[PDB]
Amino acid sequence: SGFRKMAFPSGKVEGCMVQVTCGTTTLNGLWLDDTVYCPRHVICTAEDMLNPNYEDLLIRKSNHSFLVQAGNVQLRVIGHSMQNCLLRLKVDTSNPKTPKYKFVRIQPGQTFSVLACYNGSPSGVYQCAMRPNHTIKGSFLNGSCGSVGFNIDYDCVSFCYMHHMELPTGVHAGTDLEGKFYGPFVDIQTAQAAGTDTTITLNVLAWLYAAVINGDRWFLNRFTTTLNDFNLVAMKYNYEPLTQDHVDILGPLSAQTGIAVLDMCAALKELLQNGMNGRTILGSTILEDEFTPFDVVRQC
Ligand SMILES: *C(=O)[C@H](Cc1cnc[nH]1)NC[C@@H]1C[C@H]2CCCC[C@@H]2CN1C(=O)CCNc1ccccc1
């Protein structure tokens, strides 16, 4: 019993973290086989950042402009190239701790584990959701660029996020491991806004199932609804529409608890319309939207 934010074990990813320095900037990189990936902004000076022409900045650099350190071992840079908003540095040593891995582009609403690193050194691990507005609500400080987000399936690490920046609102923006930003952002030091966020309805419902699996039942009722009248109320409270595909995804949880999806939906409508009246669900007064159905099943 019990239900916690739970990250994947981070060892496989820890063995890939290195330190990358260019001039006086030090930030993290990811060392897979004979390649190190890091934010290309590592090459910018204070002035360059404002309005960088990265192709111009990079052609001016050479292999010895980059220092890569793996623990206290220097790795020799023998090649460099641009990979959208990442640099790809080729090193003379293949990482012997390279796990089975792939690069995935995470979708809105999906979760991943973040390994926050400073100076090439892992510092903490936590779960985050890709927000509908293509930001993550992380916890990152200066020096954390290059920190990665990942999931694990069996043996295989699926890297999905590399951290670039914090927006003014205090949320975070970064790239996939092909170097393409999530969302409308650019790697310039200018104020950028994200779109208006919305709540991840599928995840809220999953969490409500988790609550029931853990014995929190007060918010259940016998009121029911159709998918359409649920959606009308969702829209009013800035919740994502719920689709039949989403309903289907909740099938196993629904079968496990004996609570039909639309009946839980009726439970959520009531929670949205009248609040909680001083009570908690899994210890929270907030409707939690960063556990997916999969995170619920895997844990409960
Ligand atoms: C990187 O580690 C940091 C991540 C962070 C900070 N708080 C939470 N996460 N982001 C660095 C930040 C943003 C990027 C955006 C793209 C262009 C470069 C820009 C550099 N950033 C700075 O804060 C720069 C601060 N001054 C500075 C000047 C010269 C060289 C390095 C840094």
PDB file of N, CA and C in Angstrom, residues 27-109:
ATOM      1  N   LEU A  27      28.762  22.805 -17.805  1.00  0.00           N
ATOM      2  CA  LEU A  27      27.425  22.203 -17.836  1.00  0.00           C
ATOM      3  C   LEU A  27      27.528  20.700 -18.195  1.00  0.00           C
ATOM      4  N   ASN A  28      26.451  19.941 -17.978  1.00  0.00           N
ATOM      5  CA  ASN A  28      26.447  18.530 -18.127  1.00  0.00           C
ATOM      6  C   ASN A  28      26.320  18.031 -19.543  1.00  0.00           C
ATOM      7  N   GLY A  29      26.900  16.880 -19.803  1.00  0.00           N
ATOM      8  CA  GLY A  29      26.667  16.162 -21.030  1.00  0.00           C
ATOM      9  C   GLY A  29      26.340  14.699 -20.793  1.00  0.00           C
ATOM     10  N   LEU A  30      25.828  14.069 -21.826  1.00  0.00           N
ATOM     11  CA  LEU A  30      25.418  12.706 -21.854  1.00  0.00           C
ATOM     12  C   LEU A  30      26.329  11.920 -22.796  1.00  0.00           C
ATOM     13  N   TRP A  31      27.005  10.911 -22.242  1.00  0.00           N
ATOM     14  CA  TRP A  31      28.122  10.198 -22.932  1.00  0.00           C
ATOM     15  C   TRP A  31      27.618   8.805 -23.230  1.00  0.00           C
ATOM     16  N   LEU A  32      27.315   8.542 -24.502  1.00  0.00           N
ATOM     17  CA  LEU A  32      26.802   7.312 -25.009  1.00  0.00           C
ATOM     18  C   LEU A  32      27.746   6.817 -26.140  1.00  0.00           C
ATOM     19  N   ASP A  33      28.182   5.543 -26.071  1.00  0.00           N
ATOM     20  CA  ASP A  33      29.209   5.069 -26.998  1.00  0.00           C
ATOM     21  C   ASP A  33      30.311   6.136 -27.082  1.00  0.00           C
ATOM     22  N   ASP A  34      30.704   6.584 -28.291  1.00  0.00           N
ATOM     23  CA  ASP A  34      31.800   7.567 -28.375  1.00  0.00           C
ATOM     24  C   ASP A  34      31.291   8.990 -28.683  1.00  0.00           C
ATOM     25  N   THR A  35      30.121   9.297 -28.153  1.00  0.00           N
ATOM     26  CA  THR A  35      29.508  10.569 -28.410  1.00  0.00           C
ATOM     27  C   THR A  35      29.068  11.217 -27.097  1.00  0.00           C
ATOM     28  N   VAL A  36      29.325  12.499 -26.924  1.00  0.00           N
ATOM     29  CA  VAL A  36      28.789  13.313 -25.813  1.00  0.00           C
ATOM     30  C   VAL A  36      27.788  14.376 -26.361  1.00  0.00           C
ATOM     31  N   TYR A  37      26.571  14.395 -25.826  1.00  0.00           N
ATOM     32  CA  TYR A  37      25.526  15.331 -26.197  1.00  0.00           C
ATOM     33  C   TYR A  37      25.392  16.399 -25.121  1.00  0.00           C
ATOM     34  N   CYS A  38      25.338  17.673 -25.466  1.00  0.00           N
ATOM     35  CA  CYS A  38      25.070  18.749 -24.519  1.00  0.00           C
ATOM     36  C   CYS A  38      24.377  19.925 -25.161  1.00  0.00           C
ATOM     37  N   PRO A  39      23.785  20.859 -24.368  1.00  0.00           N
ATOM     38  CA  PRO A  39      23.174  22.073 -24.961  1.00  0.00           C
ATOM     39  C   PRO A  39      24.182  22.873 -25.737  1.00  0.00           C
ATOM     40  N   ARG A  40      23.823  23.317 -26.937  1.00  0.00           N
ATOM     41  CA  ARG A  40      24.814  24.083 -27.698  1.00  0.00           C
ATOM     42  C   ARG A  40      25.050  25.438 -27.137  1.00  0.00           C
ATOM     43  N   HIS A  41      24.231  25.921 -26.248  1.00  0.00           N
ATOM     44  CA  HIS A  41      24.472  27.224 -25.715  1.00  0.00           C
ATOM     45  C   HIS A  41      25.753  27.319 -24.877  1.00  0.00           C
ATOM     46  N   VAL A  42      26.329  26.181 -24.535  1.00  0.00           N
ATOM     47  CA  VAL A  42      27.639  26.111 -23.846  1.00  0.00           C
ATOM     48  C   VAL A  42      28.682  26.990 -24.581  1.00  0.00           C
ATOM     49  N   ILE A  43      28.513  27.168 -25.901  1.00  0.00           N
ATOM     50  CA  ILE A  43      29.484  27.952 -26.708  1.00  0.00           C
ATOM     51  C   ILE A  43      29.271  29.446 -26.638  1.00  0.00           C
ATOM     52  N   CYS A  44      28.214  29.947 -26.003  1.00  0.00           N
ATOM     53  CA  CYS A  44      27.875  31.357 -26.027  1.00  0.00           C
ATOM     54  C   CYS A  44      28.624  32.139 -24.954  1.00  0.00           C
ATOM     55  N   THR A  45      29.055  33.364 -25.300  1.00  0.00           N
ATOM     56  CA  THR A  45      29.486  34.340 -24.300  1.00  0.00           C
ATOM     57  C   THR A  45      28.270  35.111 -23.841  1.00  0.00           C
ATOM     58  N   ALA A  46      28.425  35.916 -22.791  1.00  0.00           N
ATOM     59  CA  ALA A  46      27.325  36.762 -22.284  1.00  0.00           C
ATOM     60  C   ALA A  46      26.619  37.606 -23.391  1.00  0.00           C
ATOM     61  N   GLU A  47      27.436  38.231 -24.240  1.00  0.00           N
ATOM     62  CA  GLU A  47      26.965  38.955 -25.428  1.00  0.00           C
ATOM     63  C   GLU A  47      26.320  38.101 -26.536  1.00  0.00           C
ATOM     64  N   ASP A  48      26.928  36.956 -26.847  1.00  0.00           N
ATOM     65  CA  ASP A  48      26.402  36.031 -27.884  1.00  0.00           C
ATOM     66  C   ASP A  48      24.979  35.605 -27.497  1.00  0.00           C
ATOM     67  N   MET A  49      24.700  35.464 -26.208  1.00  0.00           N
ATOM     68  CA  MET A  49      23.482  34.780 -25.783  1.00  0.00           C
ATOM     69  C   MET A  49      22.271  35.542 -26.312  1.00  0.00           C
ATOM     70  N   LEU A  50      22.379  36.864 -26.283  1.00  0.00           N
ATOM     71  CA  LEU A  50      21.279  37.761 -26.493  1.00  0.00           C
ATOM     72  C   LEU A  50      20.710  37.343 -27.831  1.00  0.00           C
ATOM     73  N   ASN A  51      21.521  37.422 -28.903  1.00  0.00           N
ATOM     74  CA  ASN A  51      21.055  37.058 -30.240  1.00  0.00           C
ATOM     75  C   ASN A  51      22.047  36.206 -31.035  1.00  0.00           C
ATOM     76  N   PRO A  52      22.167  34.928 -30.661  1.00  0.00           N
ATOM     77  CA  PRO A  52      23.265  34.091 -31.153  1.00  0.00           C
ATOM     78  C   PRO A  52      23.033  33.644 -32.591  1.00  0.00           C
ATOM     79  N   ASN A  53      24.088  33.657 -33.417  1.00  0.00           N
ATOM     80  CA  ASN A  53      24.037  32.942 -34.709  1.00  0.00           C
ATOM     81  C   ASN A  53      24.875  31.674 -34.474  1.00  0.00           C
ATOM     82  N   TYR A  54      24.220  30.551 -34.131  1.00  0.00           N
ATOM     83  CA  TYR A  54      24.983  29.406 -33.719  1.00  0.00           C
ATOM     84  C   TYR A  54      25.880  28.772 -34.754  1.00  0.00           C
ATOM     85  N   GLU A  55      25.481  28.850 -36.018  1.00  0.00           N
ATOM     86  CA  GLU A  55      26.355  28.269 -37.062  1.00  0.00           C
ATOM     87  C   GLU A  55      27.668  29.055 -37.185  1.00  0.00           C
ATOM     88  N   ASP A  56      27.533  30.361 -37.069  1.00  0.00           N
ATOM     89  CA  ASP A  56      28.704  31.255 -37.004  1.00  0.00           C
ATOM     90  C   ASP A  56      29.510  30.958 -35.729  1.00  0.00           C
ATOM     91  N   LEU A  57      28.845  30.831 -34.572  1.00  0.00           N
ATOM     92  CA  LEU A  57      29.608  30.572 -33.325  1.00  0.00           C
ATOM     93  C   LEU A  57      30.437  29.273 -33.351  1.00  0.00           C
ATOM     94  N   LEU A  58      29.865  28.222 -33.930  1.00  0.00           N
ATOM     95  CA  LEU A  58      30.434  26.927 -33.917  1.00  0.00           C
ATOM     96  C   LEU A  58      31.577  26.864 -34.913  1.00  0.00           C
ATOM     97  N   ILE A  59      31.398  27.444 -36.104  1.00  0.00           N
ATOM     98  CA  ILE A  59      32.513  27.324 -37.093  1.00  0.00           C
ATOM     99  C   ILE A  59      33.801  27.937 -36.564  1.00  0.00           C
ATOM    100  N   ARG A  60      33.677  28.828 -35.616  1.00  0.00           N
ATOM    101  CA  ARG A  60      34.814  29.475 -34.999  1.00  0.00           C
ATOM    102  C   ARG A  60      35.511  28.654 -33.939  1.00  0.00           C
ATOM    103  N   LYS A  61      34.912  27.552 -33.574  1.00  0.00           N
ATOM    104  CA  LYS A  61      35.391  26.678 -32.515  1.00  0.00           C
ATOM    105  C   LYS A  61      36.153  25.532 -33.139  1.00  0.00           C
ATOM    106  N   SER A  62      36.957  24.854 -32.341  1.00  0.00           N
ATOM    107  CA  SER A  62      37.646  23.644 -32.737  1.00  0.00           C
ATOM    108  C   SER A  62      37.413  22.580 -31.665  1.00  0.00           C
ATOM    109  N   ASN A  63      37.904  21.368 -31.925  1.00  0.00           N
ATOM    110  CA  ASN A  63      37.817  20.301 -30.980  1.00  0.00           C
ATOM    111  C   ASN A  63      38.415  20.715 -29.638  1.00  0.00           C
ATOM    112  N   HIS A  64      39.525  21.450 -29.622  1.00  0.00           N
ATOM    113  CA  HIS A  64      40.143  21.715 -28.320  1.00  0.00           C
ATOM    114  C   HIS A  64      39.459  22.870 -27.587  1.00  0.00           C
ATOM    115  N   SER A  65      38.480  23.535 -28.222  1.00  0.00           N
ATOM    116  CA  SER A  65      37.594  24.461 -27.489  1.00  0.00           C
ATOM    117  C   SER A  65      36.691  23.756 -26.428  1.00  0.00           C
ATOM    118  N   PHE A  66      36.615  22.445 -26.448  1.00  0.00           N
ATOM    119  CA  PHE A  66      35.725  21.686 -25.543  1.00  0.00           C
ATOM    120  C   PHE A  66      36.551  20.748 -24.654  1.00  0.00           C
ATOM    121  N   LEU A  67      36.293  20.781 -23.362  1.00  0.00           N
ATOM    122  CA  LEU A  67      36.889  19.886 -22.384  1.00  0.00           C
ATOM    123  C   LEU A  67      35.774  18.988 -21.844  1.00  0.00           C
ATOM    124  N   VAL A  68      35.939  17.680 -21.954  1.00  0.00           N
ATOM    125  CA  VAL A  68      34.954  16.734 -21.425  1.00  0.00           C
ATOM    126  C   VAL A  68      35.698  15.968 -20.311  1.00  0.00           C
ATOM    127  N   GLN A  69      35.082  15.888 -19.141  1.00  0.00           N
ATOM    128  CA  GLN A  69      35.631  15.124 -18.012  1.00  0.00           C
ATOM    129  C   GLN A  69      34.586  14.116 -17.526  1.00  0.00           C
ATOM    130  N   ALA A  70      35.023  12.871 -17.353  1.00  0.00           N
ATOM    131  CA  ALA A  70      34.204  11.781 -16.859  1.00  0.00           C
ATOM    132  C   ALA A  70      34.819  11.406 -15.519  1.00  0.00           C
ATOM    133  N   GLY A  71      34.168  11.826 -14.436  1.00  0.00           N
ATOM    134  CA  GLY A  71      34.804  11.774 -13.113  1.00  0.00           C
ATOM    135  C   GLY A  71      36.048  12.646 -13.191  1.00  0.00           C
ATOM    136  N   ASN A  72      37.201  12.129 -12.763  1.00  0.00           N
ATOM    137  CA  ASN A  72      38.442  12.917 -12.880  1.00  0.00           C
ATOM    138  C   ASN A  72      39.285  12.505 -14.095  1.00  0.00           C
ATOM    139  N   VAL A  73      38.694  11.787 -15.053  1.00  0.00           N
ATOM    140  CA  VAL A  73      39.373  11.480 -16.309  1.00  0.00           C
ATOM    141  C   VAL A  73      38.979  12.434 -17.454  1.00  0.00           C
ATOM    142  N   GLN A  74      39.993  13.010 -18.077  1.00  0.00           N
ATOM    143  CA  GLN A  74      39.827  13.802 -19.289  1.00  0.00           C
ATOM    144  C   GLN A  74      39.522  12.880 -20.479  1.00  0.00           C
ATOM    145  N   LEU A  75      38.471  13.181 -21.246  1.00  0.00           N
ATOM    146  CA  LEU A  75      38.198  12.476 -22.482  1.00  0.00           C
ATOM    147  C   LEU A  75      38.586  13.399 -23.662  1.00  0.00           C
ATOM    148  N   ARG A  76      39.326  12.890 -24.617  1.00  0.00           N
ATOM    149  CA  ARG A  76      39.782  13.737 -25.696  1.00  0.00           C
ATOM    150  C   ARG A  76      38.654  13.983 -26.703  1.00  0.00           C
ATOM    151  N   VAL A  77      38.293  15.232 -26.945  1.00  0.00           N
ATOM    152  CA  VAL A  77      37.385  15.572 -28.062  1.00  0.00           C
ATOM    153  C   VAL A  77      38.093  15.480 -29.443  1.00  0.00           C
ATOM    154  N   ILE A  78      37.565  14.618 -30.324  1.00  0.00           N
ATOM    155  CA  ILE A  78      38.137  14.382 -31.681  1.00  0.00           C
ATOM    156  C   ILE A  78      37.171  14.709 -32.799  1.00  0.00           C
ATOM    157  N   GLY A  79      36.012  15.280 -32.439  1.00  0.00           N
ATOM    158  CA  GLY A  79      35.073  15.719 -33.442  1.00  0.00           C
ATOM    159  C   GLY A  79      33.938  16.489 -32.793  1.00  0.00           C
ATOM    160  N   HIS A  80      33.332  17.378 -33.557  1.00  0.00           N
ATOM    161  CA  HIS A  80      32.173  18.162 -33.094  1.00  0.00           C
ATOM    162  C   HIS A  80      31.273  18.500 -34.236  1.00  0.00           C
ATOM    163  N   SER A  81      29.977  18.573 -33.936  1.00  0.00           N
ATOM    164  CA  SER A  81      28.993  18.952 -34.908  1.00  0.00           C
ATOM    165  C   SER A  81      27.709  19.363 -34.171  1.00  0.00           C
ATOM    166  N   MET A  82      26.841  20.050 -34.896  1.00  0.00           N
ATOM    167  CA  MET A  82      25.596  20.596 -34.429  1.00  0.00           C
ATOM    168  C   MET A  82      24.502  19.585 -34.679  1.00  0.00           C
ATOM    169  N   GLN A  83      23.529  19.442 -33.765  1.00  0.00           N
ATOM    170  CA  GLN A  83      22.445  18.505 -33.857  1.00  0.00           C
ATOM    171  C   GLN A  83      21.196  19.282 -33.380  1.00  0.00           C
ATOM    172  N   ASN A  84      20.656  20.189 -34.193  1.00  0.00           N
ATOM    173  CA  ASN A  84      19.632  21.134 -33.825  1.00  0.00           C
ATOM    174  C   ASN A  84      20.119  22.003 -32.672  1.00  0.00           C
ATOM    175  N   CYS A  85      19.495  21.972 -31.462  1.00  0.00           N
ATOM    176  CA  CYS A  85      19.988  22.733 -30.343  1.00  0.00           C
ATOM    177  C   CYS A  85      20.968  21.994 -29.424  1.00  0.00           C
ATOM    178  N   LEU A  86      21.459  20.842 -29.832  1.00  0.00           N
ATOM    179  CA  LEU A  86      22.520  20.130 -29.133  1.00  0.00           C
ATOM    180  C   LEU A  86      23.849  20.233 -29.894  1.00  0.00           C
ATOM    181  N   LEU A  87      24.919  20.113 -29.123  1.00  0.00           N
ATOM    182  CA  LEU A  87      26.168  19.699 -29.711  1.00  0.00           C
ATOM    183  C   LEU A  87      26.374  18.252 -29.586  1.00  0.00           C
ATOM    184  N   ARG A  88      27.004  17.625 -30.573  1.00  0.00           N
ATOM    185  CA  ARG A  88      27.398  16.249 -30.552  1.00  0.00           C
ATOM    186  C   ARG A  88      28.928  16.322 -30.567  1.00  0.00           C
ATOM    187  N   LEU A  89      29.564  15.876 -29.501  1.00  0.00           N
ATOM    188  CA  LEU A  89      31.067  15.829 -29.428  1.00  0.00           C
ATOM    189  C   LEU A  89      31.486  14.393 -29.570  1.00  0.00           C
ATOM    190  N   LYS A  90      32.447  14.125 -30.468  1.00  0.00           N
ATOM    191  CA  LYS A  90      32.939  12.791 -30.652  1.00  0.00           C
ATOM    192  C   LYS A  90      34.161  12.723 -29.784  1.00  0.00           C
ATOM    193  N   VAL A  91      34.268  11.660 -28.991  1.00  0.00           N
ATOM    194  CA  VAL A  91      35.378  11.460 -28.071  1.00  0.00           C
ATOM    195  C   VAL A  91      36.133  10.164 -28.506  1.00  0.00           C
ATOM    196  N   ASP A  92      37.374  10.083 -28.038  1.00  0.00           N
ATOM    197  CA  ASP A  92      38.269   8.985 -28.391  1.00  0.00           C
ATOM    198  C   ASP A  92      38.000   7.693 -27.594  1.00  0.00           C
ATOM    199  N   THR A  93      37.039   7.709 -26.651  1.00  0.00           N
ATOM    200  CA  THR A  93      36.801   6.588 -25.735  1.00  0.00           C
ATOM    201  C   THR A  93      35.310   6.322 -25.762  1.00  0.00           C
ATOM    202  N   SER A  94      34.949   5.064 -25.947  1.00  0.00           N
ATOM    203  CA  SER A  94      33.584   4.654 -25.935  1.00  0.00           C
ATOM    204  C   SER A  94      33.194   4.489 -24.461  1.00  0.00           C
ATOM    205  N   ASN A  95      31.971   4.908 -24.098  1.00  0.00           N
ATOM    206  CA  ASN A  95      31.547   4.764 -22.704  1.00  0.00           C
ATOM    207  C   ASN A  95      31.255   3.287 -22.393  1.00  0.00           C
ATOM    208  N   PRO A  96      32.072   2.646 -21.504  1.00  0.00           N
ATOM    209  CA  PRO A  96      31.859   1.196 -21.207  1.00  0.00           C
ATOM    210  C   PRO A  96      30.638   0.920 -20.378  1.00  0.00           C
ATOM    211  N   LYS A  97      30.052   1.987 -19.831  1.00  0.00           N
ATOM    212  CA  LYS A  97      28.799   1.886 -19.079  1.00  0.00           C
ATOM    213  C   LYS A  97      27.588   2.309 -19.895  1.00  0.00           C
ATOM    214  N   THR A  98      27.724   2.371 -21.228  1.00  0.00           N
ATOM    215  CA  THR A  98      26.599   2.649 -22.094  1.00  0.00           C
ATOM    216  C   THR A  98      25.515   1.596 -21.936  1.00  0.00           C
ATOM    217  N   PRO A  99      24.285   2.004 -21.555  1.00  0.00           N
ATOM    218  CA  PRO A  99      23.198   1.056 -21.503  1.00  0.00           C
ATOM    219  C   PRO A  99      22.576   0.880 -22.866  1.00  0.00           C
ATOM    220  N   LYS A 100      21.725  -0.126 -23.041  1.00  0.00           N
ATOM    221  CA  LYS A 100      20.828  -0.213 -24.108  1.00  0.00           C
ATOM    222  C   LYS A 100      19.944   1.033 -24.015  1.00  0.00           C
ATOM    223  N   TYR A 101      19.685   1.702 -25.121  1.00  0.00           N
ATOM    224  CA  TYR A 101      19.056   3.014 -25.059  1.00  0.00           C
ATOM    225  C   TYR A 101      18.384   3.345 -26.359  1.00  0.00           C
ATOM    226  N   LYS A 102      17.412   4.234 -26.286  1.00  0.00           N
ATOM    227  CA  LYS A 102      16.932   4.935 -27.435  1.00  0.00           C
ATOM    228  C   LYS A 102      16.535   6.336 -27.109  1.00  0.00           C
ATOM    229  N   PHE A 103      16.308   7.090 -28.149  1.00  0.00           N
ATOM    230  CA  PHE A 103      15.826   8.492 -28.074  1.00  0.00           C
ATOM    231  C   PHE A 103      14.343   8.524 -28.444  1.00  0.00           C
ATOM    232  N   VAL A 104      13.487   9.093 -27.558  1.00  0.00           N
ATOM    233  CA  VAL A 104      12.085   9.172 -27.822  1.00  0.00           C
ATOM    234  C   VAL A 104      11.656  10.622 -27.653  1.00  0.00           C
ATOM    235  N   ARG A 105      10.658  11.039 -28.414  1.00  0.00           N
ATOM    236  CA  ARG A 105      10.025  12.321 -28.185  1.00  0.00           C
ATOM    237  C   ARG A 105       8.781  12.124 -27.354  1.00  0.00           C
ATOM    238  N   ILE A 106       8.828  12.630 -26.120  1.00  0.00           N
ATOM    239  CA  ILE A 106       7.699  12.376 -25.167  1.00  0.00           C
ATOM    240  C   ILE A 106       6.520  13.240 -25.604  1.00  0.00           C
ATOM    241  N   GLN A 107       5.298  12.700 -25.424  1.00  0.00           N
ATOM    242  CA  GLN A 107       4.080  13.436 -25.661  1.00  0.00           C
ATOM    243  C   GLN A 107       3.537  14.198 -24.459  1.00  0.00           C
ATOM    244  N   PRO A 108       2.750  15.261 -24.662  1.00  0.00           N
ATOM    245  CA  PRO A 108       2.108  15.952 -23.521  1.00  0.00           C
ATOM    246  C   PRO A 108       1.306  15.005 -22.697  1.00  0.00           C
ATOM    247  N   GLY A 109       1.355  15.197 -21.377  1.00  0.00           N
ATOM    248  CA  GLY A 109       0.675  14.274 -20.502  1.00  0.00           C
ATOM    249  C   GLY A 109       1.473  13.086 -20.005  1.00  0.00           C
TER     250      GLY A 109
END
